[PDB]
Amino acid sequence: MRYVKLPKENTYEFLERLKDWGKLYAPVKISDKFYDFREIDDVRKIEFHYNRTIMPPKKFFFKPREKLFEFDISKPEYREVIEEVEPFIIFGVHACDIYGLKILDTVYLDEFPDKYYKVRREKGIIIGISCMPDEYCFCNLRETDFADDGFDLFFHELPDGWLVRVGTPTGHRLVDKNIKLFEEVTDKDICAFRDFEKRRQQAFKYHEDWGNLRYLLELEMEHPMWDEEADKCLACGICNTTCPTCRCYEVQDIVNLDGVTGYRERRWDSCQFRSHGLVAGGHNFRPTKKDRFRNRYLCKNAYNEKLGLSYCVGCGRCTAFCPANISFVGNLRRILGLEENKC
């Protein structure tokens, strides 16, 4: 891959020339300390250094509220409502978010390729940015700190600019078209990039191995910690609706006033809601609140053999955005015994 140096006086110029290609989605301020991917109109409002987004970048490919079909009851037919989408450039995707998008690609493009997801994944440019760990981020524990594939551009921050790793095609096209604004890297910036990476690795709050969580979690399925934390839990589904790797959704039918026209709607549904695991006769396969809580923990602590990564990418959205401040990493380390160590 080619390393192209972008001096800081040309970053906004490159973003303006990037807006020529298509719509730009970058993290902007929405509240006092909340970030979200909003569509860019004025480039100066983009916050380059942001902790995390309130919604993961999966909303562009796995839309939060999507109309699958519109139907007519008479002569029963379902018409798929799919619209052509121009190539959009998602600027400011963390490494953890990039791995989450890869995981959702392995979930949604496997065996049966979802058309709605594929049509939006084939026309998107992911630009990765080197994050800085705050008090919640633990992407090193789940091994999502650095990525090799999935990004067409990687903006690695430098003291005197931005180091751009192209990595993939069409990144070459963008860089070659705007090569007037770009420069060439030498050891001067390489040493600074290495020092920044060393500082980033050293700044993580947690540093321990999590090899045997998937095995030990089954031995301690009936821990009193589950009961206590579930009774502390509010069952609002925020930990899943903001999660980047939750594939679950709920399909509902809406029929108009005429009684002959309607549409089918898809939205994200969490485990905490009652009707996620319900069958006929009022039987629920995770009836109690602790049952659904443990189901979420076990499911996020599963193993994806396609790429060897656990479905949790360590973004920290679940622990940060939980109203009850239930620590995911604290609970999971207490499963290991780093907090109690009774046996």
Partner 1 sequence: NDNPYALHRVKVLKVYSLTETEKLFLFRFEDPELAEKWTFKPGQFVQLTIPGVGEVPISICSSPMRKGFFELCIRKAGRVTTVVHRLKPGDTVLVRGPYGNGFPVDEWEGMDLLLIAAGLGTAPLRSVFLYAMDNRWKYGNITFINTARYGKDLLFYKELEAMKDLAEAENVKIIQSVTRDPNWPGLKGRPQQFIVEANTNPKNTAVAICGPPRMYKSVFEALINYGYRPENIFVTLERRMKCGIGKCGHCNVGTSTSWKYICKDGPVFTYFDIVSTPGLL
Partner 2 sequence: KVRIGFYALTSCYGCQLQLAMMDELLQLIPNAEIVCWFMIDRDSIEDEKVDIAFIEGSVSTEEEVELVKKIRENAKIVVAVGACAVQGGVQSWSEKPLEELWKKVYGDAKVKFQPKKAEPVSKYIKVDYNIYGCPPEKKDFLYALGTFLIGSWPEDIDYPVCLECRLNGHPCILLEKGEPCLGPVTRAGCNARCPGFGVACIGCRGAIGYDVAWFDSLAKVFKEKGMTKEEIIERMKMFNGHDERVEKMVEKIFS
Ligand X SMILES: Cc1cc2nc3c(=O)[nH]c(=O)nc-3n(C[C@H](O)[C@H](O)[C@H](O)COP(=O)(O)OP(=O)(O)OC[C@H]3O[C@@H](n4cnc5c(N)ncnc54)[C@H](O)[C@@H]3O)c2cc1C
Q: Which is nearer to partner 2, 96 or 271 (CB)?
A: 271
* Residue among 47, 121, 74 at smallest CA distance from 260: 74
**Which of 80, 93, 81 has the alpha carbon at shortest distance from 139?**
93
Give the CA distances from residue 28 to residues 37, 60, 151, 156, in Å, rounded to whole numbers and listed in that order. 6, 16, 21, 19
Shortest CB 226 distance to ligand SF4, Å: 12
Site residues (CB under 8 A) for partner 2, limited to 245-264: 254-259, 262
Question: Does residue 246 have a known ligand-binding role?
Answer: no
Instruction: Work out whether 228 is an interface residue with partner 2 (CB under 8 A).
Output: no
Residues 282-301 that bind partner 2 (CB under 8 A): 289
Q: Given the complex with ligand SF4, which of 12 and 34 has the nearer CB atom?
A: 34
Which pair of tokens denotes residue 207?
């540093």
Helix/strand/coil for 251:
strand
Interacting stretch for partner 2, rule CB under 8 A, among 7-15, 93-101, 203-211, 232-240? 232-240
- From 8, 10, 50, select the one nearest 28 (Cα to Cα): 50
Least distance (Å) between residue 237 CB and partner 2 = 6
Neighbour-count burial of 102, counting CB atoms closer than 10 A to its CB (0-12 exposed, 13-18 middle, 19+ buried):
buried
- Give 6's strand partners: 162
Residue among 13, 17, 36, 183 that touches partner 2 (CB under 8 A): 36
233 binds, among ligand X, partner 1, partner 2, none (CB under 5 to 8 A by kind): partner 2
**According to the annotation, is 139 in a ligand binding site?**
no
What Å distances lie between residue 254 and 67, 79, 119, 263, CA to CA?
Answer: 10, 15, 25, 6
Give me Rg for the CA atoms of the chain.
22
Distance CA 58, CA 260 (A): 33
Secondary structure, 3-state, 289-306: HHHHHHHHHHHHCCCECC
Q: Tell me which amino acid residue 279 is.
A: V
Residues that bind partner 1 (CB under 8 A): 68-69, 71, 73, 75-78, 80, 107-108, 110-115, 213-215, 217-218, 221, 246-251, 253, 255, 262, 276-281, 285, 295, 298-299, 301-303
**236 in a known ligand binding site:** yes
Which H or E run includes 24? strand 24-29
248 is in an annotated binding site: no
Q: Which of residues 64-103 bind partner 2 (CB under 8 A)?
A: 64-65, 73
Q: Is 216 in the site for partner 2 (CB under 8 A)?
A: no
Q: Is 279 in the site for ligand X (CB under 6 A)?
A: yes
DSSP state letter for 279:
-
Q: Per the annotation, does 239 bind a ligand?
A: yes
- Report in angstroms how near the CB of residue 108 gets to partner 2 at its nearest: 19
Two structure tokens written together for 124: 């998107």
Residues that bind ligand SF4 (CB under 6 A): 52, 94-96, 131, 133, 137, 139, 233-240, 243-248, 270-272, 296, 299-300, 312-318, 322-324, 326, 328
Q: Which residue in the block uniquely carries the two structure tokens 């699958």?
A: 68
Does 315 show up as a binding residue in the annotation? yes
Applying CB under 6 A, does 280 fall inside the site for ligand X? yes
Least CB distance to partner 2 at residue 56 (A): 11
Cβ neighbours around 247 below 10 Å, total: 14
Minimal distance, residue 9 CB to ligand SF4, in Å = 26
Q: Are 2 and 172 in contact (CB under 8 A)?
A: yes
Q: Take residue 260 and report the two structure tokens written for it.
A: 């002959």
| Residue 243 is assigned to a ligand binding site | yes
Which residues make up the interface to partner 2 (CB under 8 A)? 30-34, 36, 54-55, 64-65, 73, 231-238, 241-242, 254-259, 262, 267-270, 273-275, 289, 321, 323-324
Which residues make up the interface to ligand X (CB under 6 A)? 279-280
Per the annotation, binding residues for [4Fe-4S] cluster are 233, 236, 239, 243, 312, 315, 318, 322
